[PDB]
Design an enzyme around this catalytic site. Sequence first.
Site, PDB file in Angstrom:
ATOM      1  N   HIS B  40      -1.382  -6.970  -8.302  1.00 39.31           N
ATOM      2  CA  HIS B  40      -1.078  -7.008  -9.751  1.00 39.31           C
ATOM      3  C   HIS B  40       0.403  -7.306 -10.012  1.00 39.31           C
ATOM      4  CE1 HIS B  40      -0.722  -2.524  -9.295  1.00 39.31           C
ATOM      5  NE2 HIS B  40       0.274  -2.683 -10.197  1.00 39.31           N
ATOM      6  N   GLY B 142       6.635   2.057 -12.274  1.00 42.33           N
ATOM      7  CA  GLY B 142       7.365   1.271 -11.257  1.00 42.33           C
ATOM      8  C   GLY B 142       7.209   1.799  -9.836  1.00 42.33           C
ATOM      9  N   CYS B 144       4.421   1.638  -8.109  1.00 43.37           N
ATOM     10  CA  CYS B 144       3.371   0.821  -7.447  1.00 43.37           C
ATOM     11  C   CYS B 144       3.981   0.068  -6.256  1.00 43.37           C
ATOM     12  CB  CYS B 144       2.631  -0.132  -8.382  1.00 43.37           C
ATOM     13  SG  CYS B 144       3.581  -0.877  -9.745  1.00 43.37           S
TER      14      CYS B 144
END
Lengths: 304, 304
Positions: B40, B142, B144
């Site tokens: 993503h 943030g 991820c």
Amino acid sequence: GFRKMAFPSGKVEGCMVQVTCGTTTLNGLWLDDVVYCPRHVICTSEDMLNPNYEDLLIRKSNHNFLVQAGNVQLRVIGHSMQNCVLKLKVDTANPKTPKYKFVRIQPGQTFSVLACYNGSPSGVYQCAMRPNFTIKGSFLNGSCGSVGFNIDYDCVSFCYMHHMELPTGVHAGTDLEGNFYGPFVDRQTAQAAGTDTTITVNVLAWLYAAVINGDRWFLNRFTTTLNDFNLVAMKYNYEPLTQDHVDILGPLSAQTGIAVLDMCASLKELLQNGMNGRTILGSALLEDEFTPFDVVRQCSGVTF
Amino acid sequence: GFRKMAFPSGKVEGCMVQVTCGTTTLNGLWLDDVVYCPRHVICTSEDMLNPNYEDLLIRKSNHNFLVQAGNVQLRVIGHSMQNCVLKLKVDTANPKTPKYKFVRIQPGQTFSVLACYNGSPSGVYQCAMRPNFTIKGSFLNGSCGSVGFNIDYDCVSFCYMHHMELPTGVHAGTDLEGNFYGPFVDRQTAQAAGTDTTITVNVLAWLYAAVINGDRWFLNRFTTTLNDFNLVAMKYNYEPLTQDHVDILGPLSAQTGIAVLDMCASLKELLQNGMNGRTILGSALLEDEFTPFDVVRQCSGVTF
């Protein structure tokens, strides 16, 4: 989701070595061309009962010190005693030396421990210097010379070197200049730690963390004064709250819209009435090993 | 003294980088000449509602990927999608690449998380894969691309990459081949996690840790059978205990002289009667995020 987070430990892992003086092996800290370790590396089991460190150190030469850093062996070319630490001058400056400071922390402040055995890291965890200057660490035999630290930007601030387990199962150690935290001495003798108290400013920080994270059940209408709160704190062996403490909680008060003396009134109710079997941040006890800086750091995503 | 210890994080810190694809920045894992990150990274906020990853990736070229590793910038010379991860081939192999494996862990097993923001470590903590394949992590926006790992001797076994926070505040992610743990998809949509259960074999491990550490108040005379214990476990949403679980607790049974079915009888009494306001290892709740290996590792001083 609000966990006891340790600092990333890489910069400290590169500084851990094994120090042997005859039978006795423990951990050491290799910065520039100096290796810092507990001065009792020079003691036999028997010596620890009543050591004269000046007299024992005199019997020792450089070649009675075997320092290993992985497979590498390190040449000791000098020794001095500073308070309760030995400084072994070595020929080669550590190529992995980080930017670093030595600091003496205050009771109630937190730091990361890199637990080591024979100069090899086992694990990393966060803990507090108790108001009575002990740490409730997780340390086994051979953990002596393990260090505690804080990281700001790219600099490691070393604040603790582990020396001993008290006959009561809590831990005592020094700053990196070899000065004990609290009344302790590096001798195998019974030693009294003070009455410990709960770090009130850290409980309040953790209640602010709870609110930020959606746990609000414990909030109440009331306020109080440092003078009135401190009467109840004294009864529950909580540390007295000062204006300095209110000043440090300011940003958390601002983020949540809950005034510091207002959160104190909620703490008072929790102390007098218990938690009635409910949890705060999935704990059934009040947590005191998160500082206000720790809460802000974690909740704002500060990196290094 | 028995703490949730994380692995030393140095070997993972050397592999964390920042990955930007247009507006979107997150964390990546640089091993050899491949950078692994959540697919993503190629989504806008809007795209996340209902992404066609094949169609979005087709719109992307190498130059739409900005990878930074400190001040160093890294040249993407290839991209592929594997399940829910992007593999960015880069020109330079990471000089800090450790010995490593990719593994898919089982529910109930634990690992260390290195929480990162813009490719910079913030902190390290230990946590469990829940039986419902979520993690109760501490992660902010943030985070991820942050990874979970275990260390054995000198090898890093990467088991988790962080993707998302569920609308319920728990965390979901993949193995390093990009396969989700549990039924989750990388889309901003409501998603059901199972009923979670308590990891019974880990509670028993932690009760053995408690005995080793001098907390013995909860031990009782009785025994039971997997069949009878499992009736009570079902009632308190505890995972069923299997012979596999008894086999893994063997060494702890041996160290303490308390048979596995005997500790199970003590657990049964704790479930039916509560703790009556007493603590075990200074917790007022039963802890399930320590495995039997974790207890043995910590209590025996295993290093890396």
